[PDB]
Symmetry: D2
Amino acid sequence: QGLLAGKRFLIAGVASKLSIAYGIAQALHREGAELAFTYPNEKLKKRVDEFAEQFGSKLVFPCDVAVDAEIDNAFAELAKHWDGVDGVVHSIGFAPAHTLDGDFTDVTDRDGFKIAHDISAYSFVAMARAAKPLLQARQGCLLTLTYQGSERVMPNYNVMGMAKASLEAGVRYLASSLGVDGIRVNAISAGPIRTLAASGIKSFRKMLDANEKVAPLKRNVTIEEVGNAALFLCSPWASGITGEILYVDAGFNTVGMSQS
Amino acid sequence: QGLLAGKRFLIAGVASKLSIAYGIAQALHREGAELAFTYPNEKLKKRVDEFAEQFGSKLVFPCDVAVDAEIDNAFAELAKHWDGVDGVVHSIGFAPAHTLDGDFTDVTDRDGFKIAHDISAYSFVAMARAAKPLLQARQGCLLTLTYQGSERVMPNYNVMGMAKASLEAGVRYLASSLGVDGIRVNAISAGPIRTLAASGIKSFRKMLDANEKVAPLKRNVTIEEVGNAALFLCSPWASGITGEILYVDAGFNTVGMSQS
Amino acid sequence: QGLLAGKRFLIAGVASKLSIAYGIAQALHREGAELAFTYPNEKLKKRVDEFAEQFGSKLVFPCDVAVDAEIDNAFAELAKHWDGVDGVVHSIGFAPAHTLDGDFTDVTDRDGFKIAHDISAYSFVAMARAAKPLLQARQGCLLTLTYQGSERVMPNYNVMGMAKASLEAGVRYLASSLGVDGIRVNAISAGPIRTLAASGIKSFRKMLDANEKVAPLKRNVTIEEVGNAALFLCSPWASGITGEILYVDAGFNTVGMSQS
Amino acid sequence: QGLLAGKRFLIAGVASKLSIAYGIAQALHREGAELAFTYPNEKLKKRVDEFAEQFGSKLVFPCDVAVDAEIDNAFAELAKHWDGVDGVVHSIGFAPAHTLDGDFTDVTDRDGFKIAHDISAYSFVAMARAAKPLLQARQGCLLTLTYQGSERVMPNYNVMGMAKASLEAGVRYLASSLGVDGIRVNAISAGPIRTLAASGIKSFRKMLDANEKVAPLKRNVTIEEVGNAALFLCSPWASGITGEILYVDAGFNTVGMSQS
Ligand SMILES: NC(=O)c1ccc[n+]([C@@H]2O[C@H](COP(=O)([O-])OP(=O)(O)OC[C@H]3O[C@@H](n4cnc5c(N)ncnc54)[C@H](O)[C@@H]3O)[C@@H](O)[C@H]2O)c1
Ligand SMILES: NC(=O)c1ccc[n+]([C@@H]2O[C@H](COP(=O)([O-])OP(=O)(O)OC[C@H]3O[C@@H](n4cnc5c(N)ncnc54)[C@H](O)[C@@H]3O)[C@@H](O)[C@H]2O)c1
Ligand SMILES: NC(=O)c1ccc[n+]([C@@H]2O[C@H](COP(=O)([O-])OP(=O)(O)OC[C@H]3O[C@@H](n4cnc5c(N)ncnc54)[C@H](O)[C@@H]3O)[C@@H](O)[C@H]2O)c1
Ligand SMILES: NC(=O)c1ccc[n+]([C@@H]2O[C@H](COP(=O)([O-])OP(=O)(O)OC[C@H]3O[C@@H](n4cnc5c(N)ncnc54)[C@H](O)[C@@H]3O)[C@@H](O)[C@H]2O)c1
Ligand code: NA
Ligand code: NA
Ligand code: NA
Ligand code: NA
């Protein structure tokens, strides 16, 4: 019997086998959890159905986080199956491509800013509100994924740094709001990982190489390591932890300047 | 001859004599600066004309930061008078009243989130872009006002904490973008001060009293103290400082728990 | 088979059943670890022998961290039994009583400062160096215990805040030094817990009550929660994490001001 | 009449014209302050007498901060001339050369640790206590110099990172202790500057070059910029600021990864 035997988690953000959300699903399922999944649009439905089947789940629901009604409906549909949930994993972020490529001052337009914040930060708050009744029933938790571009300037990131800073403050405000219900709210700040987000981004290889040289462990992290940290934060072993941004970046954030 | 003799600053955010922006204007003008001002809507025009006259200025322009064209036009109009600017002070923030009163998870709706971030965070980026040519001409600086609800949960603040976290990351991304031009970008994180924002907010008195008990100096800060810190950050004496969030809160942020 | 089956850990800092180190021992042993223990002086030997027996261990060695030779000898003796170690837990701190009671400026004498730093911060570095060969053999990890008085002023703490800040920087420098060997180095920043340290300290009850009111979870943490977080950081599930200060304080650190 | 006309400051840490303390002295004197100086040992006396004369001062006293009696005596001697002081500047740090050159775990011995902390951190606390009566008389302030190796790993720094972390916590504890008297306590975290400390350190040039590439302003800071920031923090314009670590590093600390 695994650490999460008898427990239930909703996973939002699987896109491919490289997704952080996929690695999190694998780890939770490995420890005995039953899973449910959302997909962002109809074009992704069949792929997400396939991924869910890999984890023995047929609980798959549409959820475009741009749309209030879809968030509400995803949780209403989930509630037909589950009378309570042990956790909700938010592994969702987006900014228009143009905002991430070029000089910050020049390229950060209002709509680009709006979208980055709406999809990457507000959506976690909206999902927390929609999930609240199911979370209350089992004193379940919330988890999101952030990146240290929130706290220091990182390359090719621009307005996403603003949106992740917003998200991390959201983690804290949610933790204070929902803590009275026994609901913990945390984030993982992952080091860079090749996922669908990096596809066609020529500079990603160079950034990974630079990360590998700076990180104290002298290597890049994996979705398995992020997945295991997520497993921990979603488990009874993390019952004393809320409002926390846990860095899973092989120590990169702790270095100010590396030798060479 | 004052520290800012021959220098020029645009001040966005005067609403009343209690405004942080008013205290900043007073300090810059005291040290010899020539000033220009924006007003948010027609109802505020005559009041802002009056305030500007107090500082010997007739350079007063409309600028609703919700509107791209108005931001652009304010700087085009300013450029008819000034061929360069030594600094731009952004003292602008807003969230709908309902978002600041009640449980964070329950009250933080999408539009409330959007407005808080658009007006309180994005607007600084937009103003920086519009101001860039005038700032380049004199290697001028940018300054904004933030609050420590970005970093820790503060009462009656909710989504504004997310928006200020976004703003502070914006300070850093702007500093990296504009630093090559010699343009510094900083913020002051002010302790709580009674301004128009607190009018009719019953709990504000209690929060000020609590601040006064916790702060190492055992008193609340004033717009004169914030104004003098702004003067410093807008002056040649701060030429080595960029991307900085300077706390002017009588040390409040440094205390984890106070005796009694 | 537990998560730590076949693994070996040295635990320094058991004093009583209330000790943080005792809770950590319980959790590691629960998951299958074999344990070894140190004791600070002869008066504690029999008690530590008894505690070790509770965890099926007869590996008990003297180690007063004030004495270079004792640190070296403890690891030389351990190496007669173990050809490698999966982790070393440092749960050791001390400052003279007079330094923790009264006005910081008045009571912080040179010797009090020296002792606080020597025992609470330097000792972790010394133990890391002495443990290095055994840690290298299994790519084992290091863990220490810190308190958030390092980052913000906490009551009845004084020079211990300086010593914990030193310790946390030590975590980072150790992580960068030992990371090349695959050795991770982390800390837990625990919320306040009643242990032997609080015995006879009249104000401790009031501080716990205040913690309970501020913390988002509205309760105080336990050595079981700290123990489980330690288990995580000492396990393969934390392989992506080094140089990290993980807060296990029920979210206390995330709150700037609480309602009432 | 300068900003500091009629005000008095004690400067501890002048060694050569490159010293940070020398740049601070220049700025305070430029704005009308009367100055006093300490020297560490007899070999430095004549040089410090000469520097003091450059600022129109004959108030020069021995003060080896390793020795309790010398700290006390320096302030007793100063009090024969001054019935109150507006500020005390601590620009003193040291670690044995061997501790700063090589692998942190290998080279950080107990005595090296002890000295680094005693001279670089404890001495500020001791000087604050000795200065308290003179500071109380004018509600004067305290200022120290720190480096961001406290918060992130910086090269060729090792135990000094621990000692600066200790010092910065000391700033906070002092601010809480002395704030009731109206005494502010702050630090400047300076970017790297060539001073006597770098003489014969071959790698310093490379570290400066790396700093210059990363910093948002794309240049290194000077003692004039540090001096002007110190002037600010020692002036009435900073009356709202205590417990603060002000970064004067051309924005270096705000960057996580630079392009190339
Ligand atoms: N990969 C990294 O290096 C890295 C580092 C730190 C944090 N993160 C964060 O991890 C999370 C997962 O990203 P990933 O790297 O796994 O990439 P990914 O593309 O696999 O996952 C991103 C997910 O966001 C979903 N999404 C985007 N817009 C949406 C919408 N409107 N409605 C619903 N879902 C929507 C996508 O469909 C996709 O499933 C993101 O928040 C990302 O910022 C990634
Ligand atoms: N007063 C405090 O306790 C405190 C503490 C820290 C930071 N701040 C920040 O200081 C800044 C000034 O606030 P204040 O306290 O002086 O209150 P205020 O009401 O005097 O100033 C707020 C300004 O924002 C302007 N504004 C709002 N929406 C706008 C729009 N669409 N277009 C243009 N201008 C718009 C208002 O017109 C007003 O001039 C804000 O960013 C606020 O968050 C205030
Ligand atoms: N209890 C709390 O609220 C709390 C909160 C955060 C961190 N901490 C830290 O947790 C750690 C454990 O403390 P605890 O609360 O379990 O109390 P404790 O008294 O049970 O453990 C303290 C240990 O330090 C050991 N120690 C002291 N001087 C020593 C020396 N010279 N040589 C060897 N060992 C020595 C003591 O013998 C004892 O075993 C300490 O670092 C403490 O600062 C405690
Ligand atoms: N130069 C840098 O890059 C840099 C960066 C950040 C902070 N700092 C800090 O600035 C401060 C000044 O250093 P600097 O770079 O001007 O070098 P410096 O050598 O000019 O000044 C160091 C001072 O410390 C004094 N000192 C050392 N041991 C002493 C003792 N026992 N008693 C009395 N005085 C003693 C020295 O005599 C000297 O006056 C130090 O705290 C240093 O850590 C320097
Ligand atoms: Na960019
Ligand atoms: Na609230
Ligand atoms: Na005290
Ligand atoms: Na080193």
